[PDB]
Every structure is written in C-alpha cells, then in structure tokens.
Amino acid sequence: ELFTGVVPILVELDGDVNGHKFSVSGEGEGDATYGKLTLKFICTTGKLPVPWPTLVTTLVQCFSRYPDHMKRHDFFKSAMPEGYVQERTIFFKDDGNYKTRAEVKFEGDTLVNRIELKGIDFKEDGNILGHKLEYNYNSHNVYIMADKQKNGIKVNFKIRHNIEDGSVQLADHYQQNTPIGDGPVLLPDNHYLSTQSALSKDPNEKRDHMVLLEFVTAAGI
Amino acid sequence: ELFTGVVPILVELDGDVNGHKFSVSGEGEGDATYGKLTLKFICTTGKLPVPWPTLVTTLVQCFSRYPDHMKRHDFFKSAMPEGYVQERTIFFKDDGNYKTRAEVKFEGDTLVNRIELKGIDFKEDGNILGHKLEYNYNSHNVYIMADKQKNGIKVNFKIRHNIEDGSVQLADHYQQNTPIGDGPVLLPDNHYLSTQSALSKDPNEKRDHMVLLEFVTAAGI
C-alpha cells in the first residue's frame, strides 16, 4: 500500500551537454494502480539547451500498472521505499550520447527521482542541438530482464523521436537498475512495459517547461 | 469565439465490419485554444468486435490549435457552426478497409460528430479481427491541402498501429472534407497537423470503452 493511492512526485535534474549547463525541476503525481503519470517540468536555469523530448525517458517506472498476476515481477515497487539506482547510457544515432545516474526513492510522502546527466558528442548541426525535433512522443515497449549477479534488472529499448521533416531520430537506451537497500528484491521474469507518452504546454505557465502525461502497463506474462 | 472556451463533444458511430454490427457513443470536451481533446467512448452494443485503436481516427479536427499566423488556414473552424462532411477510405495494409462518412456540426452547445462506418475484407486471421493490436497510440503528422473544385480540403496520412509482437500495422488514410453550408470557407495553404494521442481505461467504468486524450497543433507555415 505504498503506491495504492495517488503519490506525489518530485523530479530534480542537473545536467551538462557539450558544456551547456542547466537544471530542470519537475512536479506531479502518479497513480500506480492506473499506471497514470502526470508531471510538469520547468527549466529553472532559463531556456533549455536541448529539446524537451530528449529528456523524457530521463525525467519513475515504479508507477507502472502491473496486472494482478505479475505483482511478483514488479522490481520497481519491490525496491521501495529504500529505492533503486537507475543508470543509463542513451545513444542518439549519428549524434551524441547521454549518461545519467539517478536515485529514485521515497523521501517522506513524496517519491523523489534525483538525476545527473552528462551528454557529449552532440553535433551542433545535429537534430538534438539543432532543436530540429518536434514536441511530441510515440509509444514504445520497454524490455526488462533480471540481472542475477547485480541483483537488479537490465532494461533496454529504442526511442523514436520525430523530426520536423518526417524523419525519425533513433535513441538507443541501455538501462540498469539496482536496489539501494540490502533487503531481497523481486527479480522478474522477462517482460516489457508498454508505455504511452504525450507532451503538452501550459497556458498559465510563463517559464520554459514541458507538461507530460504518461500511461504505462506491464505485459508479456 | 465559437471555440474560445471549452466545448462539449458528443460522438455517435454506428458501424458494420464483416457483418458484425455495433454502436459507439462518446462523450467529452475539447479546448481548441490548447488543442486538447478529452473523450470517453462506450460500446453500447456489448463487446466491440474490432480493436479500440482502429476507431481512433474515426471517432473532430476542428479542436486543433492553429497558431495565430495560421488562423486563415483553419478550414475546420471556418465551416462552423454549419459544419462539414468528413469522408474517409482507410486501408489496413494486408487486411480490410473502412469507409466512413460523418457530418460534424454544432447542435446547440455541443459539437456533434455523427458517423457511419462499413468495413470489409478483414481477414479473420488478421491483426484487426484477430485483436492482435496493443491498446496504445503513436503520433503522426496529418497532411492537409485545399481542394479548389470541391471547396474543401484533401487530407492524408498513414497510421502505425502497434502489434503485440513488435510489428507495425499500417493504415492508409484517404480523407476528404467539404463544408455543409454554401457560405465561403477558408481554403488553406498546404500544412499538416501534428497530433499526439493516448488511450487509457477507466476504473469506475464497467462497460466496454476507451478513454482517449489527444493533443493537436497545426504547423508547416
């Protein structure tokens, strides 16, 4: 019953991409029982140097709806409330790469996801730094597998960001999660997470930001 | 100022696919100024014979946010409140096809979209009738062009529905819209509509249904 109700969420990211330093603070709430996520992110350091869509996977998979018969495969919720470290190496096809480390744990009533991001090799003529990506999102299947030795899971999927000239920027994701505590955690059978995401703005919001709504449901078992 | 506020929406579809007759009633509201759409659809004839995702494009493009400098390209809103007839021939790659005719007009305070759908050639072993499609949606760019002679627009795009085995069902859309009134309507320059859609369920909803949230913004000018 840690996630049985609507849980408040706080996201804090400090990043660095080709020297361009910035920060993003996010607020929202998620309903696990429904896999619904509702968040708002403001770029507290001015104008975001990178497209908002490229930070979507970075800025809380524990809010996924795991159907009843899969509750024994929910590593995310089983690491709570102590948490898990989420690391990723995301490769933007024919452009730079992001390296992010984040710890997502409960801090009282709020589920907090603190992250650090470093991105490099981004061409200044590229989609990413060129800001040639459209403000929208597709739906992908996120693949999970247990990592026995490390006592976590290995996750992996490819994101397809849309470019304004009907092209598609691919972004390969290499993700790993380990619990932060020493208590046993649920190591799951192979399965994926079907996730849908939608980006919108906010009229009454003056600062640079992104509104993100997202639905996630576990499957493959 | 017909669409300046939140407008209520009513969708009514009666369909026939390979003989399987059914009806879908939908309710919701849209905010044009924001391009946000929020609708809920119930299958009033029992269990929907076709996957809910295949009816998404069928079940009100006048709720798109047309940035200020494009208000002269908004055919949809310029046909109001009298309306427009929206016809489509959608071809499901390697499977059947849908033929839908719908009139969408204002009926008092509510924007009503009444539709008739006939689908044929759907293989019983196919994705569609086989219900092998996942309950989710991608984002596509809907292409508009004026149709001088007919006094409307020709619209066209391809939808990529996801299949549970990481495949992609393509669905070619051939759409045409003509005003219902004889007053002059705005014929637009070529441009597209960037649309994002997300499907979800509803806990307190017992009947067969689909919850659809959708963001649309005009571009290409």
Structure tokens at B89: 């021939």
- Virtual CA dihedral for B62, B177, A135, B160, nearest 10 degrees? 130
Which of B33, B139, B198 is nearest residue A215 as measured by Cβ atoms?
B198
E strand or H helix at B11? strand B6-17
**B156-173: buried (b, 16+ CB within 10 Å) or exposed (e) per residue?**
ebebebbebeeeebebeb
* Whether the Cβ atoms of residue B123 and residue B129 lie closer than 8 Å to each other: yes
Structure tokens at A17: 């991409």
Distance between alpha carbon A10 and the CA centroid of its chain, in Å? 13
A166 and B197 within 8 Å at the Cβ level: the answer is: no
CATH number of the CATH domain containing B186: 2.40.155.10
Q: Which residue of A has its CA nearest to B157?
A: A166
Tell which of B143, B161, B196 to mutate to test the A interface (max A CBs under 10 Å): B196
Using CA of residue A31, residue A35, residue A36, residue A40, what is the dihedral sign?
positive
Burial of B107 (0-12, 13-18, 19+ CB in 10 A): exposed
Structure tokens at B2: 């017909």
Tell which of A136, A197, A214 to mutate to test the B interface (max B CBs under 10 Å): A136
Structure tokens at B115: 């539709």
| Location of structure tokens 């493959």 | A220
Using CA of residue A14, residue A18, residue A19, residue A22, what is the dihedral sign?
negative
What is the experimental resolution, given in Å to one decimal place? Answer: 2.3
DSSP class of residue A31 equals E
E strand or H helix at B77? helix B75-78
Specify the number of domains making up chain A: 1
For residue B179, how many other CB atoms are within 10 A of its CB? 21
Distance CA A35, CA A97 (A): 29
Contacts of A27 (CB under 8 A, 6+ apart): A9, A10, A11, A39, A40, A41
Method of structure determination: X-ray
Could you tell me the end-to-end alpha-carbon distance of chain B, in angstroms, rounded to an integer? 23
Distance CA B104, CA B83 (A): 6
For residue A71, how many other CB atoms are within 10 A of its CB? 12
- Name residue B22's amino acid: F
Which of A166, A196, A203 is nearest residue B136 as measured by Cβ atoms?
A196
Q: Which residue of A has its CA nearest to B201?
A: A34
Binding-face residues of B in 136-175 toward A, CB within 8 A: 136-139, 141, 162, 164, 166
B137 and A139 within 8 Å at the Cβ level: the answer is: yes
B166 and A200 within 8 Å at the Cβ level: the answer is: no
Q: Where are the alpha helices (DSSP H) in A57-206?
A: 75-78, 127-130
Distance CA B88, CA B155 (A): 9
Q: Which residues of B touch A203 (CB under 8 A)?
A: 33-34
Distance CA A72, CA A83 (A): 17
Which of A162, A201, A214 is nearest residue B139 as measured by Cβ atoms?
A162
* Whether the Cβ atoms of residue B209 and residue B43 lie closer than 8 Å to each other: yes
Which of A34, A199, A203 is nearest residue B34 as measured by Cβ atoms?
A203
Which of A36, A139, A203 is nearest residue B136 as measured by Cβ atoms?
A139
Distance CA A152, CA A146 (A): 6
CB of A197 less than 8 A from some CB of B = yes
Distance CA A207, CA A203 (A): 10
For residue A47, how many other CB atoms are within 10 A of its CB? 8
Q: Which residue of B has its CA nearest to A31?
A: B203
Distance CA A13, CA A101 (A): 10
* Whether the Cβ atoms of residue A159 and residue A170 lie closer than 8 Å to each other: yes
Task: Please give, rounded to a whole number of angstroms, the shortest distance from the CA of A52 to a CA of chain B.
Answer: 15
Structure tokens at B181: 């009134």
Distance CA A185, CA A181 (A): 9
Using CA of residue B158, residue B82, residue B112, residue B118, what is the dihedral sign?
negative
A136 and B194 within 8 Å at the Cβ level: the answer is: yes
CB of B89 less than 8 A from some CB of A = no
Task: Please give, rounded to a whole number of angstroms, the shortest distance from the CA of A207 to a CA of chain B.
Answer: 17
Which of B134, B203, B213 is nearest residue A198 as measured by Cβ atoms?
B213
* Whether the Cβ atoms of residue A47 and residue A60 lie closer than 8 Å to each other: no
Structural domain span for residue B72: 1-221
Distance CA A141, CA A137 (A): 13
Which of B33, B139, B201 is nearest residue A138 as measured by Cβ atoms?
B139
A33 and B203 within 8 Å at the Cβ level: the answer is: yes
* Whether the Cβ atoms of residue B152 and residue B75 lie closer than 8 Å to each other: yes
Spatial CA neighbour of A49 closest among A23, A72, A27, A26: A23
N residues, chain B: 221
Task: Please give, rounded to a whole number of angstroms, the shortest distance from the CA of A20 to a CA of chain B.
Answer: 29
Strands (E), chain A: 6-17, 20-31, 36-42, 84-92, 97-107, 110-120, 139-147, 152-162, 168-179, 191-200, 209-219
